[PDB]
C-alpha cells in the first residue's frame, strides 16, 4: 500500500503515485512483478531493486502523440 | 595504377581501415566512422600495403 508506506517519505510517496499510476490498483497498492528468471530468489531481487529504483528516482511514439495533441489544439481553439 | 592504403584514425583509438586510391593522387584524408569513439572522425593515410 503506497499511501500507508511510512518507510517512504511523503514528498516521494506522492511522486511515485503520479509516476506509477499504471501500477496502482483500486485498493491503492503498488504492484511489481518479475518473471525474467526461473529462480524466485532472483525474481524477488529484481522486484526489490525495482522498488529501490522507484524510491531513488522519486528522490531525484511520443512524436505521434505530440503532433496529434498539437492538432487537437488547432481545433479546440473554439473560443466562446 | 591503384594502391591499397592503410588509413589510421586521428582519434588515437588505433582504428585502421584499408581503401584504394590512384597512385598519382595525394595522401588521402577522409571522414570515416571510428567505432571506438562511436563517431565519424578524420583518417589520414599512413601506409601503402600493395598495388591493386
Amino acid at each position: 500500500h503506497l499511501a500507508t508506506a511510512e518507510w517512504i517519505a511523503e514528498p516521494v510517496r506522492q511522486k511515485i503515485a503520479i509516476t506509477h499510476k499504471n501500477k496502482i490498483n483500486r485498493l491503492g497498492e503498488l504492484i511489481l512483478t518479475s518473471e525474467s528468471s526461473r529462480y524466485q530468489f532472483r525474481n524477488l531481487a529484481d522486484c526489490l531493486q525495482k522498488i529501490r529504483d522507484m524510491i531513488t528516482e522519486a528522490s531525484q511514439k511520443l512524436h505521434r502523440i505530440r503532433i496529434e495533441n498539437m492538432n487537437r489544439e488547432r481545433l479546440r481553439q473554439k473560443r466562446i | 595504377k591503384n594502391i591499397l592504403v592503410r588509413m589510421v584514425s586521428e582519434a588515437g583509438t588505433g582504428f585502421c581501415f584499408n581503401t584504394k586510391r590512384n597512385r598519382l593522387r595525394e595522401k588521402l584524408t577522409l571522414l570515416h566512422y571510428d567505432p571506438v569513439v562511436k563517431q565519424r572522425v578524420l583518417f589520414v593515410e599512413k601506409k601503402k600495403i600493395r598495388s591493386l
Binding site: - | 591499397l4 584499408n18 584504394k20 591493386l52
Partner: protein, 95 residues
C-alpha cells in the same frame, strides 16, 4: 590414421582435427569459414560477416572427425568460464 600404435597398441588422434575443430558434447562439430583472414579488401561486408561466423558441420564430416579423434575429446568438460557451455547440450530437439 593409426588404429593400433606400436608402443601402446592404441588408436591415435589427428592433431590437425584437434587444432582446427571444436567438439560440443551433444555431438556437434564447430568450425570457422575458410578464407576469413584472406583478401578482405575484395570481400563485401555481408560476405565478411558470413566468413566471421562459427558454423556447424555435416553428419558425414561429424562422423569423420569423431573417427579421427579418440574418446578423450568427447568427454564432458566442466571448464570455469567456457563460452560454449550453453551449446554443450540440446534443448527442444525432436528427432
Amino acid at each position: 590414421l593409426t588404429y593400433f600404435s606400436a608402443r601402446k597398441g592404441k588408436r591415435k588422434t589427428v592433431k590437425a582435427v584437434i587444432d582446427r575443430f571444436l567438439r560440443l558434447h551433444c555431438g556437434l562439430w564447430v568450425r570457422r569459414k575458410a578464407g576469413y583472414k584472406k583478401k578482405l579488401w575484395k570481400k563485401t561486408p555481408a560476405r565478411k560477416k558470413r566468413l566471421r561466423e562459427f558454423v556447424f558441420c555435416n553428419k558425414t564430416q561429424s562422423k569423420l572427425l569423431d573417427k579421427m579423434t579418440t574418446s578423450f575429446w568427447k568427454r564432458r568438460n566442466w571448464y570455469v568460464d567456457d563460452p560454449y557451455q550453453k551449446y554443450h547440450d540440446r534443448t527442444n530437439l525432436k528427432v
